[PDB]
Write a protein that binds this ligand. Sequence first.
Ligand SMILES: CN1CCC(c2ccc(-c3ccc4c(c3)C(=O)N([C@@H](C(=O)Nc3nccs3)c3cc(F)ccc3O)C4)cc2)CC1
Ligand SMILES: CN1CCC(c2ccc(-c3ccc4c(c3)C(=O)N([C@@H](C(=O)Nc3nccs3)c3cc(F)ccc3O)C4)cc2)CC1
Ligand SMILES: Nc1ncnc2c1ncn2[C@@H]1O[C@H](COP(=O)(O)OP(=O)(O)NP(=O)(O)O)[C@@H](O)[C@H]1O
Ligand SMILES: Nc1ncnc2c1ncn2[C@@H]1O[C@H](COP(=O)(O)OP(=O)(O)NP(=O)(O)O)[C@@H](O)[C@H]1O
Ligand SMILES: [Mg+2]
Ligand SMILES: [Mg+2]
Lengths: 298, 297
Amino acid sequence: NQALLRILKETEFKKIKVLGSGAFGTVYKGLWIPEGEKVKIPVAIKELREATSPKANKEILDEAYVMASVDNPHVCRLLGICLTSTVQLIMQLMPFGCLLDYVREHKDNIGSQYLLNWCVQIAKGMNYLEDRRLVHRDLAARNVLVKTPQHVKITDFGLAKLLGAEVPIKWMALESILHRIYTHQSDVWSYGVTVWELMTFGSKPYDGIPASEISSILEKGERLPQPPICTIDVYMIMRKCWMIDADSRPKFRELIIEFSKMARDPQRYLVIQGDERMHLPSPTDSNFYRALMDEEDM
Amino acid sequence: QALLRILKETEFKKIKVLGSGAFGTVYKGLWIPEGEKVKIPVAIKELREATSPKANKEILDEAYVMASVDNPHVCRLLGICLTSTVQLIMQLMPFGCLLDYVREHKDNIGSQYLLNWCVQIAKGMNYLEDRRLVHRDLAARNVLVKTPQHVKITDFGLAKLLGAKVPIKWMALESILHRIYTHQSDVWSYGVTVWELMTFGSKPYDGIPASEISSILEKGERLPQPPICTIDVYMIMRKCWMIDADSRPKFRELIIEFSKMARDPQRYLVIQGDERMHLPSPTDSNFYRALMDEEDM
Ligand SMILES: CN1CCC(c2ccc(-c3ccc4c(c3)C(=O)N([C@@H](C(=O)Nc3nccs3)c3cc(F)ccc3O)C4)cc2)CC1
Ligand SMILES: CN1CCC(c2ccc(-c3ccc4c(c3)C(=O)N([C@@H](C(=O)Nc3nccs3)c3cc(F)ccc3O)C4)cc2)CC1
Ligand SMILES: Nc1ncnc2c1ncn2[C@@H]1O[C@H](COP(=O)(O)OP(=O)(O)NP(=O)(O)O)[C@@H](O)[C@H]1O
Ligand SMILES: Nc1ncnc2c1ncn2[C@@H]1O[C@H](COP(=O)(O)OP(=O)(O)NP(=O)(O)O)[C@@H](O)[C@H]1O
Ligand SMILES: [Mg+2]
Ligand SMILES: [Mg+2]
């Protein structure tokens, strides 16, 4: 349990390059230097922007042990922590980066099979979090990491203390905006938005609409529009994720089944120009990726 | 089959020489997947051997077998590039080989690590025997450190290259005299490898010319007892160097034996300071695996 979170000293790792920043911190590519060894092992380091106290560190540690305990091929595990004046969190470095930037940069080379398999894998990770009774609270395409093009994993989940102290309005369920209710069913809403981001190849939701006005348009019944590549079958799933009654939305278990069905005949459900020129990797290419970058069970 | 990737020269680059052995030169390299911007570390062995279409069919036939292994303590060949020279691709191990590792940590290795390594090498060799693959070049230099807690056997199965130096000082007597190679001659090499670990990387029969090794073995002389070994450990080595190959232990038996010793390591190895030596801890082991070593153990 406790042994799943490594407490690091400042002297055993170094930040080398900024990768980006989000709501709560700055992410670096870093190197871990095991004590007494000569190797330098790449890691990802999130340094929180606000400094904390030792008593606040007890809060951080209690949540960190939970995020270090996940065990699922589609969920990123928190690996280590360093309690400096600003706290540093350590996880596996994903050289491919997040799925949002990946779909934007490869938008002219992504076929229906990849898109639908990503939907399945994200739903599998979210179902695992629900099984663990952990609400994500910040699901979005930016918080899905690409381990390989064939294998994505959810990250940055469970941050109830950081979000409560303050928000991704355009990903949040209406009951979260209006009433600060976060459940697995509000995660289903965020999942629908994440799917919309993938199917639009990384468009910004409600582009140009101030966040302060989003709950009003949602109450009036407006929703994200049908992506050009989506058949009516896919868009109805998205719309069901955004129903006002949270208990009427699909369950992650059901979304796994439905997107898995679609992934068995992907060109019936997504209409992409060029789709027959793009396919999943041959077993040869997948075996090579896995041996070099992705040896976990999956 | 799908386990061996055929690579083109345009998708990988050699970056730095790591060293050279009997048959080639190993480089740290980079793989760039087509259509992607990432650069993925690999280890590349470029053979000295020249390449003809006829030789390439032979190389490919052997390569498919070496790409087919599936065991946590055995390295798998991953890919090949057949240009003017053969280039072989496998996972890059930043810690390097176990011989260099024990030489460099000569004053910091405890008995738990040493005996755990003996267990793991025996598990990898038992798998090769299960697959009917004779190693032919087992030695501490051909055991790679994936993490300090996890080693893997490499460079096995090279019957055609060795059949055309010879590692006399690791070879069973019947291999020196007649080029007979079996799993029981691998057991002899395993014994020498354990001796290398227990001496923290001493050279076997140091200063004795290779041409005189068979003379020394025929009279009953063997590698001497390492200072840290109790008689129980040294007798395992001596049993691996019995003249009658069928009398040597089997790898399957060595797994059981060293596993029993690894459960009480300070009874079987006497290392000064052993109680202040680092042990493999769960916290460090979970961190290593997550960062460098996610395969099923
Ligand atoms: C400021 N005042 C006082 C103190 C309170 C507070 C409470 C808890 C934390 C805390 C604890 C644990 C984590 C996080 C935050 C977090 O941001 N974490 C991510 C994560 O580390 N991201 C990364 N990116 C790249 C490298 S590390 C993460 C990684 C992962 F692998 C899986 C889930 C996950 O959430 C983990 C911070 C502050 C808040 C209000
Ligand atoms: C005249 N006539 C014509 C040609 C004949 C010939 C036949 C087969 C080969 C062949 C085929 C396959 C391999 C090897 C050699 C070999 O050296 N291989 C190692 C290996 O690649 N080492 C590495 N280090 C770092 C990166 S790659 C290796 C890697 C591994 F992961 C597991 C086992 C293994 O042996 C693989 C060469 C020549 C011989 C003589
Ligand atoms: N483990 C990782 N490996 C590689 N890049 C990462 C990793 N974690 C995060 N990043 C990238 O680092 C940058 C900063 O991430 P982060 O600070 O979490 O901001 P964010 O994901 O965009 N917004 P948010 O998480 O909702 O607050 C983004 O480009 C991430 O994709
Ligand atoms: N996958 C690998 N990752 C990192 N270093 C490696 C890898 N494979 C081999 N090396 C190192 O590369 C160097 C050259 O290896 P090699 O050419 O096989 O010679 P050798 O192991 O010393 N002797 P031999 O294999 O018996 O001919 C040695 O320092 C090896 O430890
Ligand atoms: Mg994030
Ligand atoms: Mg070698």
